[PDB]
Ligand binder design. Structure first.
Ligand SMILES: Cc1cc2nc3c(=O)[nH]c(=O)nc-3n(C[C@H](O)[C@H](O)[C@H](O)COP(=O)(O)OP(=O)(O)OC[C@H]3O[C@@H](n4cnc5c(N)ncnc54)[C@H](O)[C@@H]3O)c2cc1C
Ligand SMILES: NC(=O)c1ccc[n+]([C@@H]2O[C@H](COP(=O)([O-])OP(=O)(O)OC[C@H]3O[C@@H](n4cnc5c(N)ncnc54)[C@H](OP(=O)(O)O)[C@@H]3O)[C@@H](O)[C@H]2O)c1
Ligand SMILES: Cc1cc2nc3c(=O)[nH]c(=O)nc-3n(C[C@H](O)[C@H](O)[C@H](O)COP(=O)(O)O)c2cc1C
Length: 609
């Protein structure tokens, strides 16, 4: 991953004095970082956001060479509280370097979901580490939260941070400064225009290994079917064919897919703006001396950008709102949009409840504020990149070597906005028909969710709802280990659904596995076949005695998947009580015991929200 030259020098030659780095894997930290970088303007200073992977942080010690220099970090934490992929490099350096950062002014804003254990472990580490190296914190450590409203935590922090910096450096506060320039292309050859590929032009038709995030492999959907018997929701099973892709994976890994936005939605946005979505165009950084020449693959059409490259369904951030206000001919509306940036008062309230709460996407806002009619080109520059969506492979590669399986629930809910929101990836995937050739752009991502190495070790799997997913690959694999002739320890599944005739995923397959003996136990909690709720943990508590046996002496591995919100957190506490009672020990020591399994690789997680 060839590094760019000294970022300090890039600042010198560009007149910059502040730089923001992002530890972003889904784009959050990256937009904050850009927003932050943009702000520099308001105070006679100039900034720049940058991926830390592309640079060499050892150069922080050269940062003092620039007057009123400052460096911000917007790191995001990942599973078990580790650096984001792009920050891994920087993380190790901080863990080895002893370079003197005397003179370095810095501030850290951490993006971490509070209901996470290592709530912002990364951001804390960087805040604390740059200090030990001799740098001086210029503003308190920010600890944004994804479970509440990171967007507000970011604004609270943002409004306080800048004054501090201006106060400190002693500068006063200073106009829509567009970042790109529109260039319409008219006769341009069709063979050189992007039509949805993520990387090199034509890479989707001319598929060529290796296949990663930047050059995904379009696998053909060979099976797409309804898994739940009932009709309240739509739970599906898909099978992607990775034949001839040289792609490798193991049960417990994730598969990432790049989706396409709803054609109807994209059509309405262009319609309500009175724009021709078929105009081929390009957007080039107005800042000739910038690394990001284009906000997304160009030349391309507006239709193609809204469909494959942009996020047109999540609630717009306050910064986007504020920038749009100037385009609302009706005063009271312009004022509303402006006041969405507000840190307090009814401004911050209107935003939290009318935008975030109601789940109003870009189109909804355009419709609910009829005087708002921004020019398409500027709007595209403000919207964020469409992110890939991850899924837990529901197959064992030892069994389905040329197939990757997906277990997903289609997202479709009622927003308070009054309309029906559709999940981007799940709607798209649900629509893919084996077409007797439906292609899904994708790539695999290694994880640390792994069955034991000694096939004889006991395996306790807890995965209600769509959390079964990884476990199907696990079971197929332990079912196969027996067939081979190997000795397989106990395999216990703890699963849950609402009703056995509603959404009992893989009811047949799991019955077979149980009959054969691949499943030592198949405990299923139907939370809705009776007045009171019965969940997987209730079953874990029931079987406390036996489970402690498999744990304290059997050396069993525990795996929890599915809801990260509360199903786990209850399942985690249920393990605490098991341990506390069958040890025995006091609660506090049960918690240590369990926590020690998590670090010894005997307690794993694959949970999402
Ligand atoms: C590591 C990992 C593993 C995962 N594994 C799987 C898996 O194997 N199977 C699976 O089904 N999913 C899994 N997911 C989730 C998956 O990545 C997607 O988030 C999910 O499929 C939704 O995709 P979408 O683009 O259709 O939804 P989007 O269009 O991105 O919408 C998602 C958002 O809609 C909002 N929303 C949904 N319901 C409501 C509501 N009722 N009220 C208000 N807001 C709501 C929330 O903001 C939610 O985050 C996993 C995620 C991660 C990160
Ligand atoms: N809430 C959101 O806005 C939001 C947004 C995106 C995704 N999601 C999550 O994505 C998933 C979508 O559905 P799904 O098929 O995966 O799951 P699901 O069908 O909603 O849940 C599967 C089983 O888990 C049970 N359960 C509920 N809470 C539990 C808990 N606290 N402890 C143990 N079991 C619990 C459910 O029972 P009951 O349901 O009968 O209680 C059901 O029996 C859910 O986790 C959903 O919450 C939520
Ligand atoms: C698979 C997964 C694991 C996560 N693990 C953690 C964690 O351990 N600690 C934490 O604070 N946040 C965790 N988060 C939440 C992210 O830290 C948070 O959503 C942040 O907004 C991500 O920003 P990004 O968009 O730049 O990645 C996790 C999120 C996902 C999807």
């Amino acid at each position: 991953p060839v590094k760019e030259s000294s970022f300090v020098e890039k600042m010198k030659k560009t007149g910059r004095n502040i730089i923001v780095f992002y530890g972003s894997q889904t784009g959050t930290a990256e937009e904050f970082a850009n927003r932050l970088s943009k702000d520099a303007h308001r105070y006679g200073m100039r900034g720049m956001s940058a991926d830390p992977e592309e640079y060499d942080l050892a150069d922080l010690s050269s940062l003092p060479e620039i007057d009123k220099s400052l460096v911000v970090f917007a790191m995001a934490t990942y599973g078990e509280g580790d650096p984001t992929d792009n920050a891994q490099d920087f993380y190790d350096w901080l863990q080895e370097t002893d370079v003197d950062l005397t003179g370095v002014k810095f501030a850290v804003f951490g993006l971490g979901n509070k209901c996470y254990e290592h709530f912002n472990a990364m951001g804390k580490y960087v805040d604390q580490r740059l200090e030990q190296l001799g740098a001086q914190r210029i503003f308190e450590l920010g600890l944004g939260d994804d479970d509440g409203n990171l967007e507000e935590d970011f604004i609270t922090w943002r409004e306080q941070f800048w004054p501090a910096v201006a106060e400190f450096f002693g500068v006063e506060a200073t106009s829509s400064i567009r970042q790109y320039e529109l260039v319409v292309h008219e006769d341009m050859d069709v063979a050189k225009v992007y039509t949805g590929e993520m990387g090199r032009l034509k890479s989707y038709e001319n598929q060529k290994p290796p296949f990663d995030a930047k050059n995904p492999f379009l696998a053909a959907v060979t099976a797409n079917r309804k898994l739940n018997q009932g009709t309240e929701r739509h739970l599906m099973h898909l099978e992607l064919d990775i034949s001839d892709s040289k792609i490798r994976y193991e049960s417990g890994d994730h598969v990432a897919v790049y989706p396409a936005n709803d054609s109807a939605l994209v059509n309405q946005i262009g319609e309500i703006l009175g724009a021709d979505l078929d105009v081929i165009m390009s957007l080039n950084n107005l800042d000739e001396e910038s690394n990001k020449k284009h906000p997304f693959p160009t030349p391309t059409t507006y239709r193609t950008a809204l469909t494959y490259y942009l996020d047109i369904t999540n609630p717009p951030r306050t910064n986007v709102l504020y920038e749009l206000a100037q385009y609302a001919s009706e005063p009271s509306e312009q004022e509303h949009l402006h006041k969405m940036a507000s840190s307090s008062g009814e401004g911050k309230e209107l935003y939290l409840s009318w935008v975030v709460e109601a789940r109003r996407h870009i189109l909804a806002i355009l419709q609910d504020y009829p005087s708002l009619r921004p020019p398409i080109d500027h709007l595209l520059e403000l919207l964020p990149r469409l992110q890939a969506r991850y899924y837990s492979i529901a197959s064992s590669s030892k069994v389905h070597p040329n197939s990757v399986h997906i277990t997903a629930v289609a997202v479709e809910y009622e927003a308070k906005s009054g309309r029906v929101n559709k999940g981007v990836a799940t709607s798209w995937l649900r629509a893919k028909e084996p077409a007797g050739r439906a292609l899904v752009p994708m790539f695999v991502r290694k994880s640390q969710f792994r069955l034991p190495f000694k096939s004889t070790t006991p395996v306790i799997m807890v995965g209600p709802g769509t959390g079964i997913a990884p476990f199907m690959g696990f079971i197929q694999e332990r079912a196969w280990l027996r067939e081979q002739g190997k000795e397989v320890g106990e395999t216990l599944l703890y699963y849950g659904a609402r009703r056995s005739d509603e959404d009992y995923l893989y009811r047949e397959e799991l019955a077979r596995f149980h009959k054969d003996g691949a499943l030592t136990q198949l405990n299923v909690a139907f939370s809705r076949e009776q007045a009171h709720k019965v969940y997987v943990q209730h079953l874990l508590k029931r079987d406390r005695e036996h489970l402690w046996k498999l744990i304290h002496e059997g050396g069993a591995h525990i795996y929890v998947a599915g809801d990260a919100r509360n199903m786990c957190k209850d399942v985690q506490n249920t393990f605490y009580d098991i341990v506390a009672e069958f040890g025995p020990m006091e609660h506090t020591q049960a918690v240590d015991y369990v926590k020690k399994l998590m670090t010894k690789g005997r307690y794993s997680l694959d949970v999402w929200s």
